[PDB]
Structures are given as C-alpha cells and as structure tokens.
C-alpha cells in the first residue's frame, strides 16, 4: 500500500496501474547528481583519527559509490581535521578494478572531536593546509600503504531517497566484521520466465529455455564482497564450481547464475573498467565444437596487439552460442574457447585471477 505505481506502453498509448514492489535498473550512472551524508563531520573525523592512531594507513573502496562519497567529503574532512589541530590529510585517488579486500575495519569512536560543524555540504569553509601525514584512499599508492593495512567495507546505507532536484544518501559506520555486500540497495525479482539480480553496480539477467540459465550481465565494477543469500533465488543444491560469475566477485549463489557446458570464469578480463557478459560470437570470428581442442586456460582477446582478428576458435565440450565479454578495448572469449591453429604466444591474455 505504501508503494503505488503505473506502467506505460509507448507502443499502444496504454497504462496499467496498481500497487506492489518495483525494482528499477539504476546501474547506468548510479553516481551522477548525488548528495552523500556519511556518519557526521565530527564523528567521521574522530573515526579517521582513531584509525590512523591504530595503525590503519588507508582505505580500499568496496564500490564506485564509496569512492565518490570520499571524493565529495574530503574537503570538509580536511577542514575539520585542521580545526582540531590534527596533523592529518585525506587524499582520494582513482579506483582500479578489481577492488581487492582489506582486512581492517574503521572503528566506531566513543567521542567525537569537540570542534566543528553539525552538517555536510555547508559552512563555506576555507581550504586546509597540506601536511606530511596522508590518509590515502585507493589510488596508485600500494607502496606506502600496503593492502595489508587498509580498511574495507565499513559503511551501511540507512536511506536512499529520491528528492525533487537532488537525491540524498545517508551512511553510517557499522560496528561488526562482515564480508557481505550492503543489502539495502539490492533488488531481485522474477516474473514468469524472466528474472534479474541487481544492485547499484550489477544487472544480471536470466531466462528459462528448458532450464533456467544466465542470459546477459552488465557490470560497471568488480567488487569482491559476497552476495547475501536472503536476496537470492534458488540457492540450494548448487556447487561453487558452476557459477559463471565467481563467488569471489560478488556473484549470486544461484541456479540462475549458470549455463550448461561452462564452469566458473576465474580468469576472465576482470581488469576492465566495465564489462558486458553476453552469449554471442565476437565479430568476424567463428567457433566450432571439437574433441581435439585444447584445455581451458586464461581468457584471450579476439584481436592481437596490432589489431588483426583471429577467425578460428574451438571448444571441447561447450555449447553454442559462445560466451564472450564486451569491454572498451575489444571482445574477449571465455576460458573454454581457444584458437584452432594460431599459437597463443602471439595473443593478448588476462593477467588477473579471482
């Protein structure tokens, strides 16, 4: 009753209205035009200072949203840390996939710093002065703050509101250890013969042909938390070795995450900034099924370094149409598909594993 909604048909100029549950495809930007409000100015400053005094040097972001939030808040953090006379600077860099885990967590301060503001995005402050102690948020900085000394997955979303002109987000520092992705932004639905698992960064679709199987996926990031089981369809009697998207990369532990003839893709092109998994041949190539084809290895790109395409591929026991990845630099193939007569020493391969 709280949620009422209408569905439109642009083809027939028709409308159907009613009440229920609505799941929106929010992964196009999921980042543009947002107003983030982490815990509190003084609270967050105290937490950062206590973390620095405890041996934590930096933060490894769990998703793009957290990186954007840090980038938007760094100015006020620096101002407030300056005001309390704390010799500390927060530096925010770019994010590089995949986003590896960190073994630390931000602490919950008992008392906040007794100086500063009471809200975010205000006070018309003056920029602080750079210091020699830097609290680094992920960038190309794995020499002074190694991954072993970084925090990871420390926030919980409290409210994701859609305002008239700008849309607010309310965060909070959690109190317990966890490896699960935030369940407040996950939406899963099945209706007839189509399903979808989704969140702010993933949009995974599955279909029913003669069995439920994966259809296509659209990822704008590669996080490494765990998908909650409470937001997953058909989680029983499934083994880790058949999930297409690996469990280590926040893949649902579901029968909807499978396809016949393929096993888990531990060595795909997970270094890309954005992927689209789909079952279709790379342009200009052809795939056969032969028993003499080679064994599975790391994923290969369709075009060599110079830019010419390889037009002969085989797989041992996979099923058509082939599994492929679509990135900005080109088209890759799944681990099960290898060139028919071309030496692999002249091809581009992936150097990442999950």
């Amino acid at each position, epitope marked *: 009753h709280h949620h009422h909604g209408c569905s439109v048909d642009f083809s027939k100029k028709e409308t159907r209205c009613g009440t229920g549950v609505f799941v929106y495809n929010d992964v196009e930007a999921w980042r543009d035009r947002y107003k983030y409000h982490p815990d509190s100015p003084r609270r967050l400053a105290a937490a950062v200072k206590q973390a620095w005094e405890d041996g934590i040097c930096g933060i490894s972001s769990v998703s793009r949203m957290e990186n954007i939030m840090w980038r938007s808040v760094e100015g006020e953090l620096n101002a407030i840390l300056e005001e309390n006379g704390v010799q500390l600077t927060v530096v925010v860099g770019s994010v590089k996939n995949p986003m590896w885990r960190g073994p630390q967590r931000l602490p919950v301060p008992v008392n906040e710093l007794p100086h500063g503001w009471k809200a975010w995005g205000k006070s018309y402050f003056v920029r602080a002065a750079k210091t020699n102690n830097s609290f680094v948020v992920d960038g190309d900085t794995l020499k002074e703050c190694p991954l072993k000394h970084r925090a990871w997955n420390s926030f919980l979303v409290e409210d994701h509101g859609f305002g008239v002109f700008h849309t607010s987000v309310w965060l909070k520092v959690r109190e317990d250890y966890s490896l699960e992705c935030d369940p407040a932004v996950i939406g899963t639905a099945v209706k007839g013969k189509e399903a979808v698992h989704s969140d702010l960064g993933y949009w995974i679709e599955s279909e029913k042909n003669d069995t439920w199987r994966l259809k296509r996926a659209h990822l704008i990031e590669m996080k490494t938390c765990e998908w909650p089981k409470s937001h997953t369809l058909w989680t029983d009697g499934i083994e880790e070795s058949d999930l297409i998207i690996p469990k280590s990369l926040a893949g649902p532990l579901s029968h909807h995450n499978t396809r016949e003839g393929y096993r888990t893709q531990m060595k795909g092109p997970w270094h890309s900034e954005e992927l689209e998994i789909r079952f279709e041949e790379c342009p200009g190539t052809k795939v056969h099924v032969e028993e003499t084809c080679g064994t599975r290895g790391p994923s290969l790109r369709s075009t060599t370094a110079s830019g010419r395409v390889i037009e002969e591929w085989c797989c041992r026991e996979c099923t058509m149409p082939p599994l492929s990845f679509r990135a900005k630099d080109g088209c890759w193939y799944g681990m099960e598909i290898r060139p028919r007569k071309e*030496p692999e020493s002249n091809l581009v391969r992936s150097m990442v594993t999950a």
Partner: antibody
Amino acid sequence: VELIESGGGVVQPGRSLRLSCAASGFTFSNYAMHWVRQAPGKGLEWVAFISYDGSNKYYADSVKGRFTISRDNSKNTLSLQMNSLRAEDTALYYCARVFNGYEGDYWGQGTLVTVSS
Amino acid sequence: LTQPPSVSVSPGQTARITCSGDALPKKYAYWYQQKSGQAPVLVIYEDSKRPSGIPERFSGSSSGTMATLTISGAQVEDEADYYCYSTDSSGNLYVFGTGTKVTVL
C-alpha cells in the same frame, strides 16, 4: 619497415657478446620479435622469442640458459646478450618479425658472429 | 619438421614440396623462400594464402600431418631454398624445416 642490427665480430671462445637491432617505420610496441641464426651454407634455425611487451620469453633448447633476450619499447631497441659462447654459435644472426599474417614479415640484414681463437 | 633434401624439375612442370611433422594438424605453417645471398621472403602463410605481390603460380595446402607447397609452371627464377616454419604443441617454441633445394633445368 627498417630493421638494422649490429654488434657482431670475432670473439674468443668462452667470452660474451651483445647484439642490438634498431627498428623504425612501425609501432614497435605492438609486435613480437624473433631471433634467427643461419650457419654458413646451412639452413635457418630459431633462437629466441619475446612477447609484444617483454612479459614472455622463450629460448631454443640448444642455447637455453646461455642466452637472454630483451627489448626497450621506449627507444625501439631489441637486444640479445650471449654468454659462454662456443664454436657451434658461428653463424649469421637475423632480427625477424614473422607470424603476422597479411601484415607482412620483415627481416634484418644479418651480423656475422664467428667464435674461434 | 622434415623436408626432402632436394627437388629437381624441368621448366613448365610442377614442383611438389612436402613438410611433415607432428602438431601440424593443430598449428599453421608458413613458407619462406631464400634466394642465394639474400634475406628470406614469405610466399605462403596460414597454409593456403599468398601475400600480395607473389606470383599466382604459388599455392599450398595442409592435410592431417603434412603441409605441401606447389610450384605450378616452375621457371628459372625459382632457384631457391624453401623452409616451412611452424610451432610445437605448446605454441611457445618455434621451429624451421630442414630446407629444400629446388633446381630448375
């Protein structure tokens, strides 16, 4: 489309020698390069291979361990460091760009290396 | 990879050059021509194709475990040495054929 290699000469057995090959006319950081040698009056023979960015390196069995290959993508230079030479290594050495179908296969000119005393 | 030591033909005839070896059913083979005192020249790539600028009398094919080069209408300027070039089962170690001497009478 110009491959010029140099650095050969007469050397006593057991010493070490270094070869170089300068490339121009194409994007050097996009192609893998080979080293091929040919004894006087005999057939061609593969020696070594380096990937398009130096990540992968493979050597022939007869010279494995003694030799080493490297490249410098910044200045378009290919090099082969040879150690513990013997009499069997006397041959003309090439600097090839083979296995690039319909994109052309270009060879150097050859720098003779003779091992004796 | 092994090839016959020599092949001798008459002008206007056809020359068949064979290169037999393992891992050939799974890998391509390139053919190189080296005239006396020059750098080798590619004449056939991927077992059936010829690069632009090579006379249309050059043809080749592969079948099972043997790749063959055919010189249709062999003439006098084809005095050369021919080498098949391929890889080993892993695709990591390359290898040349023993070479074939072609004499045209």
